[PDB]
Amino acid sequence: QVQLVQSGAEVKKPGASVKVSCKTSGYTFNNYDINWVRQAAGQGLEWMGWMNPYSGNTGYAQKFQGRVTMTRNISITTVYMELSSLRSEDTAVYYCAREVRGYGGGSDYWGQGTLVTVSSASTKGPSVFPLAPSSKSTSGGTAALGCLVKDYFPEPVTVSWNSGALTSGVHTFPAVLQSSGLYSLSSVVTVPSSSLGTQTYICNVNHKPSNTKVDKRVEPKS
Amino acid sequence: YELTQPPSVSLSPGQTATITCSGDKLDDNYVCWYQQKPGQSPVLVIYQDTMRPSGIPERFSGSNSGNIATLTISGTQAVDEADYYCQAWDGSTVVFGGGTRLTVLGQPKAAPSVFIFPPSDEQLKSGTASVVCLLNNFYPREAKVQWKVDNALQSGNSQESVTEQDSKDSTYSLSSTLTLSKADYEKHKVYACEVTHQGLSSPVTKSFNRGEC
Numbered sequence: 001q002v003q004l005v006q007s008g009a010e011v012k013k014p015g016a017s018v019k020v021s022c023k024t025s026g027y028t029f030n031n032y033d034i035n036w037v038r039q040a041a042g043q044g045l046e047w048m049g050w051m052n053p054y055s056g057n058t059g060y061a062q063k064f065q066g067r068v069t070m071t072r073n074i075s076i077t078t079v080y081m082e083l084s085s086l087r088s089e090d091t092a093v094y095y096c097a098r099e100v101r102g103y104g105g106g107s108d109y110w111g112q113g114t115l116v117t118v119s120s121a122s123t124k125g126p127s128v129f130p131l132a133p134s135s136k137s138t139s140g141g142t143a144a145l146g147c148l149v150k151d152y153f154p155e156p157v158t159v160s161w162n163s164g165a166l167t168s169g170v171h172t173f174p175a176v177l178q179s180s181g182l183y184s185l186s187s188v189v190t191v192p193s194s195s196l197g198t199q200t201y202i203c204n205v206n207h208k209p210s211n212t213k214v215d216k217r218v219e220p221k222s
Numbered sequence: 223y224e225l226t227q228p229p230s231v232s233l234s235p236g237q238t239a240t241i242t243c244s245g246d247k248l249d250d251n252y253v254c255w256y257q258q259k260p261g262q263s264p265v266l267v268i269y270q271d272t273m274r275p276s277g278i279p280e281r282f283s284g285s286n287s288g289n290i291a292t293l294t295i296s297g298t299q300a301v302d303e304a305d306y307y308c309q310a311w312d313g314s315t316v317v318f319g320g321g322t323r324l325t326v327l328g329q330p331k332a333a334p335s336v337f338i339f340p341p342s343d344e345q346l347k348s349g350t351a352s353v354v355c356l357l358n359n360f361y362p363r364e365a366k367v368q369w370k371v372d373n374a375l376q377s378g379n380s381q382e383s384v385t386e387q388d389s390k391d392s393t394y395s396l397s398s399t400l401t402l403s404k405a406d407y408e409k410h411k412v413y414a415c416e417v418t419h420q421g422l423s424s425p426v427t428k429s430f431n432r433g434e435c
């Protein structure tokens with residue numbers, strides 16, 4: 001039996017609030033404390049606070065004073081964490097995790113996490129810029145080229161090359177969320193340097209949320 | 223109160239991993255350790271300094287003394303590659319260490335191939351400049367990319383992305399993108415990404431001068 005299950009992904013504007021749900025089993029609800037812990041992309045774990053669902057007692061980390069609200073609903077054995085006054089730096093995966101409560105047994109069961117994306121952005125299609133092969137992207141007999149898919153929202157975007165005919169040596173990177181609240185990613189491919197004068201290279205970009213479809217030819221820098 | 227972990231630990235299979243975690247009030251309180259693999263939730267491997275939860279292999283052990291907590295992994299195997307976090311309580315609040323990336327070298331090191339891309343003229347028209355540094359097909363995953371503009375370190379205006387491990391040769395690739403305003407971009411000449419990697423004896427620098435053709 002699953003002991004913890006969280007609500008789905010959230011997108012919120014700066015200044016708004018987000019309420020994450022964590023439904024627990026009866027056993028977990030009655031005998032454990034629940035910790036709330038968040039983690040931003042490529043960063044570490046950050047503890048936010050705790051709640052004892054049976055009693056309703058709570059504690060928060062000083063950094064989140066006033067901004068976090070932990071509540072419960074006994075009838076459906078669910079606990080909640082609401083984070084208010086959201087800012088870009090609050091974009092992260094938010095976890096609930098149970099612990100028996102020196103007298104701490106650790107967080108031995110974790111929810112799947114809830115992604116919260118904080119951005120002021122409305123739906124927006126990407127600009128697609130060439131990453132042109134040049135002497136500065138040539139390592140011996142291999143040349144690198146690509147497409148910069150910049151300033152779109154929300155996820156996701158897909159990229160292919162030459163309408164799917166070119167797959168070898170292609171690396172399409174996971175997107176990053178910029179400080180602007182828009183996503184950006186790159187798709188690159190390594191090819192024989194000798195092919196640059198004779199072979200055509202086109203990246204095919206589809207950002208379905210904005211219905212943006214772009215084919216960008218990538219030519220050597222002259 | 224903060225807990226200090228080594229950012230990275232690299233060893234060979236079968237060797238014994240030692241991951242430390244220091245803090246003023248450690249001998250006051252119990253330490254727990256968590257394992258986290260990419261795309262997954264943390265897993266508790268040690269609690270109360272030395273205790274293994276049920277189902278955790280016996281090669282994981284812990285100790286805490288002299289304000290230093292240590293996670294030890296005997297006969298380190300491939301499945302042990304992960305990020306490891308220590309954690310304690312100071313009175314009420316929980317504190318996490320910064321995390322230790324544990325790399326188990328399963329194949330020879332491969333230095334990255336480094337490529338640099340100036341901003342396109344098309345983008346410059348839009349009033350922004352993106353400079354992309356590509357590290358291609360390297361092993362192990364740990365790599366550092368830093369931006370220098372006219373030999374001045376750049377902080378706060380770059381972002382990194384890494385691919386998943388290649389199924390076949392088990393290598394990685396990484397992109398670093400420096401974003402400036404068009405104005406700031408045009409105020410400088412030398413753009414460089416400095417790359418360090420265990421497969422490199424010394425740092426490698428790929429650079430260009432704004433206007434090279």
Ligand SMILES: *[C@@H]1O[C@H](CO)[C@@H](O[C@@H]2O[C@H](CO)[C@@H](O[C@@H]3O[C@H](CO)[C@@H](O)[C@H](O)[C@@H]3O)[C@H](O)[C@H]2NC(C)=O)[C@H](O)[C@H]1NC(C)=O
Pocket residue numbers: 073074075076
């Ligand atoms: C704890 O959770 C339970 C169940 O989610 C809450 O009970 C539910 O409360 C809502 C609103 O108070 C009820 O919805 C109402 O339904 C009627 C008919 O469908 C509709 O006309 C109303 O406009 C309203 O939407 C819902 O029926 C009710 N469900 C049950 C099983 O009682 C409860 O309020 C929660 N407790 C706390 C303290 O939050």
